[PDB]
Structures are given as structure tokens and as C-alpha cells.
Amino acid sequence: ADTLLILGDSLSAGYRMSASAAWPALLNDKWSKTSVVNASISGDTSQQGLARLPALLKQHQPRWVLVELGGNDGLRGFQPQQTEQTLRQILQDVKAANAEPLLMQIRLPANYGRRYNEAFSAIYPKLAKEFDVPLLPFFMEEVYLKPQWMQDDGIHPNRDAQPFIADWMAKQLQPLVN
Structure with missing residues (x-):
């Protein structure tokens, strides 16, 4: 069975709940044909995620990698530019491991006004096009x-x-995982 690696933060790891309660575990139960490995950690920034990527790719040899990171890069001293470069590196490492990267669009709280949110959110569409990969909605x-x-x-x-x-x-990934 092929493996889908989820590289994310609290939205995928589950916030203040066990991993077994988080949606990736429920999806895995629904999917036998496809193994879902939840390599997510609450609080992780895109950089912390990239730091764990090398070991994960070598260990799980996934066919598809769902990248759900960036949301925490709000209070870590990183600007949209940094987050963008970090995510770019992630997509590269994924492709280099002969795996299909699946990027998820991330959006920040409304209490951030215009300029910053638009800038943060714009990163994903840019990268999705740059690497010609699927851009899942948030x-x-x-x-x-x-x-x-x-x-x-x-x-x-x-x-x-x-x-x-x-x-x-499941519905969003179904066409992607064939």
C-alpha cells in the first residue's frame, strides 16, 4: 500500500487532543489501500517541519506528502519571505525524494488586517504554481x-x-491519491 505523509502542525496533529482523535487517524481508518502517516506536531513552524523532513522521507518513502505548515510562522521572527523560502525548500526535498508534494493553502486570523494576511496567503498560490503542484483549499x-x-x-x-x-x-485527496 502506498504511503501519504502528512507534514503539519496543530491543525493536523490535533490541538489539545490525542493523535488518535485527530482527523489524520480517522482518515487512516477510512483508508488498507493507502497508509496515512501523521508526522505533525503542535506549535511547529515551517522551519521546524523542514528540519524533520529528511528523516521522514528516508524512513517512510512516501509517494505523496501533504504540506500543512506556515500558520505558526506568525510569532517566530519570520516574515512571509522567510516562510516562503522554507516552504520552497520543503517542496524541493519532497520532489527530490520522488514523492508528489501536496500543498495546502493556509490563511491567518482576520484580526491581522489586510497587508500581512494577503501577503502571507499569497505565498501558497505562488509556490503551487512555481512547482506545478496541487494546492488544496484551507x-x-x-x-x-x-x-x-x-x-x-x-x-x-x-x-x-x-x-x-x-x-x-478524503474527498479532496481521493483524486490526487488516484
Whole structure:
């Protein structure tokens, strides 16, 4: 069975819940034909993710790598330019390992105004085109529309949301994982 490696942060690792409760575990249960390895860690910045990538690629030899990073690069001393370069390196390493990188669009809180959010968000479409890879929509967009699926911080999805996200991801990934 082929392997899908998820390289992400709290949105994929699960925030204040076990890994077994996070959507990647639910997706894995739904998928036998395709193994889903959740290499996500809460709090991770794109840089911390890239630092773990080499070992993950060599160990799991994934066919597809879902990159869901950048959201934490808000308070780490990095500017959109840095986050962009870091993600660029990730996509390169993925392709170099003969794996198909799947980039997910990330969007920042509305309480950040124009300029910075537009700049941060613009990074993903740019890279997706540069490497000619799939650019998945930010799944949290649909979750925000359901207050009952959001944790208190108004940032992370709760336990009740995971099943929905798993289904959403299955549908989005299905065509990509063939």
C-alpha cells in the first residue's frame, strides 16, 4: 500500500487532543489501500517541519506528502519571505525524494488586517504554481462556519470537528491519491 505523509502542525496533529482523535487517524481508518502517516506536531513552524523532513522521507518513502505548515510562522521572527523560502525548500526535498508534494493553502486570523494576511496567503498560490503542484483549499474555512466545531481560542478545530475534516480531506485527496 502506498504511503501519504502528512507534514503539519496543530491543525493536523490535533490541538489539545490525542493523535488518535485527530482527523489524520480517522482518515487512516477510512483508508488498507493507502497508509496515512501523521508526522505533525503542535506549535511547529515551517522551519521546524523542514528540519524533520529528511528523516521522514528516508524512513517512510512516501509517494505523496501533504504540506500543512506556515500558520505558526506568525510569532517566530519570520516574515512571509522567510516562510516562503522554507516552504520552497520543503517542496524541493519532497520532489527530490520522488514523492508528489501536496500543498495546502493556509490563511491567518482576520484580526491581522489586510497587508500581512494577503501577503502571507499569497505565498501558497505562488509556490503551487512555481512547482506545478496541487494546492488544496484551507480546510479551516469550512470549519470556521461552525462555531460548535471550534475550540475556545477560535483558532483550532475541536474533537467534534475531526470527523468532518477527515471526510473533507478524503474527498479532496481521493483524486490526487488516484
